[PDB]
Amino acid sequence: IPASEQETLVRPKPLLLKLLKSVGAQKDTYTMKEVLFYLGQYIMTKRLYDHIVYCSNDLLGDLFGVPSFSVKEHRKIYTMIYRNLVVV
Numbered sequence: 514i515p516a517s518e519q520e521t522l523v524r525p526k527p528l529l530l531k532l533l534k535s536v537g538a539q540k541d542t543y544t545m546k547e548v549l550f551y552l553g554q555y556i557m558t559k560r561l562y563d564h565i566v567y568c569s570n571d572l573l574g575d576l577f578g579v580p581s582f583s584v585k586e587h588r589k590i591y592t593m594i595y596r597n598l599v600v601v
């Protein structure tokens with residue numbers, strides 16, 4: 514995963530936007546750096562993470578389509594996030 518990916522510009526779909534709005538200011542266009550931080554912050558503030566995030570109990574699970582995932586499998590995380598946004 515190249516660092517340049519963090520600079521890419523994206524627009525979250527409605528359910529992802531709902532999640533992001535609980536940790537950051539609403540924007541019409543975000544960088545992937547922003548999306549990753551806000552999602553990460555959401556997970557930490559809600560203590561869904563202690564390397565496993567448990568989200569069967571949360572909107573995040575509905576967004577990702579999984580009951581849990583590892584914080585270390587970055588490829589899979591990127592793929593899960595991208596189902597929930599549109600590139601601009």
Ligand SMILES: CC(C)(C)S(=O)(=O)C[C@H](C1CC1)N1C(=O)[C@@H](CC(=O)O)O[C@H](c2cccc(Cl)c2)[C@H]1c1ccc(Cl)cc1
Nearest residue numbers: 549550552553554556557562566584585586587588590591
């Ligand atoms: C402290 C923080 C800045 C808020 S954070 O680093 O984002 C916290 C979250 C963790 C889920 C709660 N998080 C991490 O702890 C670490 C884990 C690691 O070292 O590999 O980085 C995660 C990360 C960062 C960038 C890209 C990806 Cl795909 C994952 C990264 C992570 C981000 C987003 C998701 Cl969906 C999952 C993990």
